[PDB]
UniProtKB/Swiss-Prot annotation, chain B:
Belongs to the eukaryotic ribosomal protein eL31 family. It comes from Homo sapiens (Human). This is Large ribosomal subunit protein eL31. One of its GO terms (cellular component) is extracellular exosome. The modification Phosphoserine is found at S81.
From Swiss-Prot, chain C:
The chain holds residues 2 to 64 of 196 of the full protein. Signal peptide: none annotated. This is Large ribosomal subunit protein eL19. It is found in: Cytoplasm. It comes from Homo sapiens (Human). The keyword Cytoplasm applies. The modification Phosphoserine is found at S12.
Curated annotation (Swiss-Prot), chain D:
The gene is RPL3. It comes from the Eukaryota. Coiled coil: none annotated. Component of the large ribosomal subunit. The ribosome is a large ribonucleoprotein complex responsible for the synthesis of proteins in the cell. This is Large ribosomal subunit protein uL3. Belongs to the universal ribosomal protein uL3 family. The modification N6-acetyllysine is found at K13, K20.
Curated annotation (Swiss-Prot), chain E:
When associated with NACA, prevents inappropriate targeting of non-secretory polypeptides to the endoplasmic reticulum (ER). Binds to nascent polypeptide chains as they emerge from the ribosome and blocks their interaction with the signal recognition particle (SRP), which normally targets nascent secretory peptides to the ER. BTF3 is also a general transcription factor that can form a stable complex with RNA polymerase II. Required for the initiation of transcription. Belongs to the NAC-beta family. The modification N6-methyllysine is found at K6. It is found in: Cytoplasm; Nucleus. It comes from Homo sapiens (Human). This is Transcription factor BTF3. Part of the nascent polypeptide-associated complex (NAC), which is a heterodimer of NACA and BTF3 (via NAC-A/B domains). NAC associates with ribosomes through the BTF3/NACB subunit. Both subunits can contact nascent polypeptide chains. It comes from the Eukaryota. Disulfide bonds: none annotated.
RNA sequence: AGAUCUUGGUGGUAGUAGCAAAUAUUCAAACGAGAACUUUGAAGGCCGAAGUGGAGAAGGGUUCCAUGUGAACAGCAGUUGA
RNA sequence: UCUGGGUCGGGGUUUCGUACGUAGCAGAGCAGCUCCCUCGCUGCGAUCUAUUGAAAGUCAGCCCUCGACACAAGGGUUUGU
C-alpha cells in the first residue's frame, strides 16, 4: 500500500479543484495464460460442467 | 571428504530473535548444535568449553550477535559408537565480522 | 566416581569453604582412593588438591 | 455504474515512492544522493577503485 | 632439560580455568 | 507536487507525511515525524543536533 | 435392590485437572547398561552478614558417619538420598 | 532444471545519533619544571572540534545478489476398477 496525490473533479464539494491524497493498494498482475475451456449447461438443478 | 574441518560464522542474533531473556543463551547453544548437525550430517556434536564461555561471556540475555566457530568432523572411532564421525566445534576469536567468508581450512 | 566425602574433608583440612576447593578432574581415580584426612594431606601437598584464591573484590573504585 | 463517484476521471499528480521500511523521506536514489552528498562508503569505494 | 614440546604440553596442563584464575603450581605423583 | 514545506530539521516534507502544528500565538510549524516534534516540544536547539540540516550548514559539513 | 444401609472390591469420569509462589541454568569429562537431576572442572547466576551463612535451646532419637543394594519411597527419573 | 534451496559476505532500505584510538596554540583551572624560558614546558583535567551524517543493528515474517562455502534424484508408510 502507498498514497497518491490527485485533483478532484467533483462540483459542489469542498475539495473541488483541490489537491487531495488517497491511499492506494498495489496489485501486481502478470499476464495470465489460458490453457483450457469448460462449457456449462443449464439444468433444472443448476449449471453443470458439460 | 569426511575428515576436513572448516571455519564458519553464525548470526546468533538472527537465530535468537524472539527468545525470552532466561533462555537466550541455552537456545543459542541448541541452535549452534543444530547448525553443526546441518552442515556436517553428524548427530554427535561436542561444544568446546571455550566456545561455551564465549557464548556466556555477556551473561544470559545479552548473547553476542555473531560468533566465529570452527567445525571439525573427526572420526568417532575410539569406541563402539553408532556413528563413526563426530563434529567438534571450537571458537575462533576475531576482531571484526566484515567480509568474512566460510573457508576450507586444512588440518 | 563421587567425591562428596573428599571435598568435604579437603575443605576441613584446608580450613576454607568448599567453594575454594579444587579437585583435579584428570586424576579422579587417584583421589577416589583417598578416604582419610591423612591421605588428603598427601594429596594437598602433592598438588592434586589446590586451594583457589579468594575472588577479587577491589576497593580501588571506592578509593 | 451511474453515480458521480463512479465513471469519474482519475488523473494522478504525484505517486509516493518513499521508503516504507520505516519512515522514508526521499523518493529516488538520485534525490537522496544529491541531498546527502558523498558518504564515507562511497569515498572509500572510490579510494580503492581509483 | 625442558624443550619446546615439553613446554607446549605444559601450556595445556598449566591452565586450570579462564582468564583471571590462578595458575597451577605443581603436579607430582608419589607412592 | 504540492507546496513542499520544511521541518524543524530542515528536511523536505512530502505530502501525506508528518504532522502540522499551530500554536496559540499564530505561528505554524510542521514536522517530518514524531522525532522532530519531540525535539521541538522539548525545546532543543537544532544547531546542536548532529543530523539536523541547520547543524550541517552551521559546521559547514559537506 | 433399595434403607444419604455396614464391610470389601471394581468402573465411567481419565491417561483428565494437574505435576505454574520465591529470576537460571549451561558446556566438557568420569563411573555407569542407562545422565537433566550422581560427581569433577569451567562459565553464568542467586542467598547479600535481620543470609539459602556459622552455632544453640525445645523437640525428633540414630536421621550422625563409612561400605553395599537398585525390591518399595523421594507424586518424573536417579549411578543419589533424611 | 535452462540447476535448486540454504549458510555467510556485499549492496539497498531504515533505526539511533558522530564510535575506540589518535591529534588539537580548545578547554574551568590546578600541581610540578625556570642557567632554562623572554613568553615559556611537563602531568591531572569533565567537556568541545577534525578524524565522523560517524559507529552499531538491520528478518529471524524487508529487498537485490550470482561473491564464497558446502548440500541437494535421498529416507519411511500405504493406496487397484
Ligand atoms: Mg513502514
Ligand atoms: Mg443389595
Ligand atoms: Mg424392596
Ligand atoms: Mg447407601
Ligand atoms: Mg494435563
Ligand atoms: Mg504447574
Ligand atoms: Mg545478588
Ligand atoms: Mg542457619
Ligand atoms: Mg547421613
Ligand atoms: Mg518417583
Ligand atoms: Mg547480511
Amino acid at each position: 500500500m502507498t498514497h497518491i496525490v490527485r485533483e478532484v473533479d467533483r462540483p459542489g464539494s469542498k475539495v473541488n479543484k483541490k489537491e487531495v491524497v488517497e491511499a492506494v493498494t498495489i496489485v501486481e498482475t502478470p499476464p495470465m495464460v489460458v490453457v483450457g475451456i469448460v462449457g456449462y449447461v443449464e439444468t433444472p438443478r443448476g449449471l453443470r460442467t458439460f | 571428504n569426511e575428515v576436513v574441518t572448516r571455519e564458519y560464522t553464525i548470526n546468533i542474533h538472527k537465530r535468537i530473535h524472539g527468545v525470552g531473556f532466561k533462555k537466550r543463551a541455552p537456545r543459542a547453544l541448541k541452535e549452534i548444535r543444530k547448525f553443526a548437525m546441518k552442515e556436517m550430517g553428524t548427530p554427535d556434536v561436542r561444544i568446546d568449553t571455550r566456545l561455551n564461555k564465549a557464548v556466556w561471556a555477556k551473561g544470559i540475555r545479552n548473547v553476542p550477535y555473531r560468533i566465529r566457530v570452527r567445525l571439525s568432523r573427526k572420526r568417532n572411532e575410539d569406541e563402539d559408537s553408532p556413528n563413526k564421525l563426530y563434529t567438534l566445534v571450537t571458537y575462533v576469536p576475531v576482531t571484526t565480522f566484515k567480509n568474512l567468508q566460510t573457508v576450507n581450512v586444512d588440518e | 566416581s563421587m567425591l562428596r566425602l573428599q571435598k568435604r574433608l579437603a575443605s576441613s583440612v584446608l580450613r576454607c569453604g568448599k567453594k575454594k576447593v579444587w579437585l583435579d578432574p584428570n586424576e579422579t581415580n587417584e583421589i577416589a582412593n583417598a578416604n582419610s584426612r591423612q591421605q588428603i594431606r598427601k594429596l594437598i601437598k602433592d598438588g592434586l588438591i589446590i586451594r583457589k584464591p579468594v575472588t577479587v573484590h577491589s576497593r580501588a573504585r571506592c578509593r | 455504474q451511474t453515480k458521480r463517484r463512479a465513471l469519474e476521471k482519475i488523473d494522478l499528480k504525484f505517486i509516493d515512492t518513499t521508503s516504507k521500511f520505516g519512515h522514508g523521506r526521499f523518493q529516488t536514489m538520485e534525490e537522496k544522493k544529491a541531498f546527502m552528498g558523498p558518504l564515507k562508503k562511497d569515498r572509500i569505494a572510490k579510494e580503492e577503485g581509483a | 632439560i625442558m624443550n619446546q614440546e615439553k613446554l607446549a604440553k605444559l601450556q595445556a596442563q598449566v591452565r586450570i580455568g579462564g582468564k583471571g584464575t590462578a595458575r597451577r603450581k605443581k603436579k607430582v605423583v608419589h607412592r | 507536487m504540492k507546496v513542499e514545506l520544511c521541518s524543524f530539521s530542515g528536511y523536505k516534507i512530502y505530502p501525506g507525511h508528518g504532522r502540522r502544528y499551530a500554536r496559540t500565538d499564530g505561528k505554524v510549524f510542521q514536522f517530518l515525524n514524531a522525532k522532530c516534534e519531540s525535539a521541538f516540544l522539548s525545546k532543543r536547539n537544532p544547531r546542536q543536533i548532529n543530523w539536523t540540516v541547520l547543524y550541517r550548514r552551521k559546521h559547514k559539513k559537506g
